Structure 1
Amino acid sequence: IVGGYTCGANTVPYQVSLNSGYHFCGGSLINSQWVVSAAHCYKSGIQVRLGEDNINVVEGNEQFISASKSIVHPSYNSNTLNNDIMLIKLKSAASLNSRVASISLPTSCASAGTQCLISGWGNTKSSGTSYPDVLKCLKAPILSDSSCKSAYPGQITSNMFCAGYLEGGKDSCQGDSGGPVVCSGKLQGIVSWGSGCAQKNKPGVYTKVCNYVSWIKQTIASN
């Protein structure tokens, strides 16, 4: 997260870190057994880390639980990033309390202009590299589909939205991928892609979660 703020420990209780020996992506806990992330985050050997603040220090609220299964969206295209969504099942159910908690799926799609909270342990610099150890947060509005398409000609599908600031300076970034965009207490987006980070006229692009609720629910019901 570039241009954000330190969230505060366990203030984003649905935020998870996906770990294979190191943090590599974010995700969102949507019930005691299941995490939503980006398909482009797929790999084998995932350990889900819940209750994290500093990902390099054991602070007392962590739950580390290995994934038993991953399910990449059936129509995920890694070239265009269309349908950049995946489900990860935990080998055992997480213990839910105020510091570790699921986030609700949307009942309807959020609109341009709605404020959301984007969070992650990704790079904090637009030029060069610095990774924070604690969770970073950014409040950002959803942008119009027109401005989104104008920013990225020929690249924005019906399964994507832009959020952030056309002026630059405030954005998600490398290492934030798969993490949440939450608006009015609902998971509305997944950190997906963008051209660098926090560049002028290159806002972040996010997976449009509301399009996937039926797939998520059905998949969970049978796995």
Structure 2
Amino acid sequence: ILGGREAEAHARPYMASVQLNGAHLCGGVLVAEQWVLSAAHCLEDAADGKVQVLLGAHSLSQPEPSKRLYDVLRAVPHPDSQPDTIDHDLLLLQLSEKATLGPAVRPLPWQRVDRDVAPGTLCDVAGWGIVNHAGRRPDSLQHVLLPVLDRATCNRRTHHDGAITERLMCAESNRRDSCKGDSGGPLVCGGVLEGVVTSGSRVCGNRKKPGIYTRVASYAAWIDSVLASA
């Protein structure tokens, strides 16, 4: 997260760190006791390593009593998650066991009604992604409040010409933005999961290149279809 602030410890208990052999790869969001929603492109770096999900974390490295590591039993990328195509970048991860919920580990309800979030709505994006353009990694969870941008402006020639479909949403990226290591994390509007971070053009903090987020409401039937196969 660029231009954000350290989150209050365990105030975003739905946050998941998606890890490969214990290294933070992407964010994730707990959506059920045994399911984590993230971004399909995250498993490009995976190949043949233990994909795990860290729950109850504020810090990635500091010993916290609420920290729990789960193995992934199943990785369900969206069928059309063709690499480098910004569309359909959703991934469902089934945990090895049902997570015990508490003040530091709690799922986030997601929007099911297929309705666009009103532009200008303030939404919270959180992650352990880089905090500057050089690639400095924070140890503690960071967050930022970003207003939602209307789809047309985000689609626009200056922004991302022709590529922003009905299944995507955008948020302002002027100085404050999601960045490398934040994909798969949540865009939360009024406590409701509305989007999942994606990398888009991969430029961070540029006003002309808005942050792109997979519109979770567009995938309601797909999410429901996977969450029943458990």
Please give the per-residue CA displacement for 1:33-57, whole angstroms capped at 9, x wherever unaligned. 0000001112362111000111011
Query: Does residue 1:139 correspond to 2:140, yes or no?
Result: no
1:122 to 118, 129, 144: 129
2:161 to 153, 162, 177: 153
Query: Does residue 1:86 correspond to 2:91, yes or no?
Result: yes
Query: Does residue 1:216 correspond to 2:217, yes or no?
Result: no
Deviation of the 1:95 alpha carbon:
0.5
Map of 1:15 onto structure 2: 15
Deviation of the 1:79 alpha carbon:
2.9
Deviation of the 1:170 alpha carbon:
0.5
Please give the per-residue CA displacement for 1:90-119, whole angstroms capped at 9, x wherever unaligned. 010111012110000113332222111100
Aligned-pair identity (%): 37
Deviation of the 1:124 alpha carbon:
0.7
SS of aligned partner of 2:41? helix
| Structure 1 gaps, min length 5 | none
TM-score (norm 2): 0.92
Instruction: State how far apart, in whole Å, the 2-side matches of 1:190 and 1:152 are.
Output: 18
SS of aligned partner of 1:193? coil
Map of 1:31 onto structure 2: 32
Could you tell me whether the CA contact under 8 Å between 2:75 and 2:94 is conserved in 1? yes
Instruction: State how far apart, in whole Å, the 1-side matches of 2:209 and 2:57 are.
Output: 30
SS of aligned partner of 2:32? coil
Query: Does residue 1:202 correspond to 2:203, yes or no?
Result: no
Could you tell me whether the CA contact under 8 Å between 2:3 and 2:144 is conserved in 1? yes
Could you tell me whether the CA contact under 8 Å between 2:86 and 2:200 is conserved in 1? no
Deviation of the 1:14 alpha carbon:
0.2
Map of 1:61 onto structure 2: 66
TM-score (norm 1): 0.95
Map of 2:112 onto structure 1: 107
2:171 to 163, 171, 177: 163
The number of aligned residues is 220
- One-letter code aligned to 2:98: A
Instruction: State how far apart, in whole Å, the 2-side matches of 1:53 and 1:79 are.
Output: 30
- One-letter code aligned to 2:35: W
**Which range moved further: 194-203 or 143-152?**
194-203
- Tell me the C-alpha RMSD between the 2 structures: 1.2
| Structure 2 gaps, min length 5 | none
Instruction: State how far apart, in whole Å, the 1-side matches of 2:160 and 2:86 are.
Output: 13
Deviation of the 1:205 alpha carbon:
0.5
Could you tell me whether the CA contact under 8 Å between 2:172 and 2:207 is conserved in 1? no
Instruction: State how far apart, in whole Å, the 1-side matches of 2:130 and 2:211 are.
Output: 14
Deviation of the 1:210 alpha carbon:
0.5
Instruction: State how far apart, in whole Å, the 1-side matches of 2:73 and 2:134 are.
Output: 36
Deviation of the 1:129 alpha carbon:
1.8
- One-letter code aligned to 1:12: R
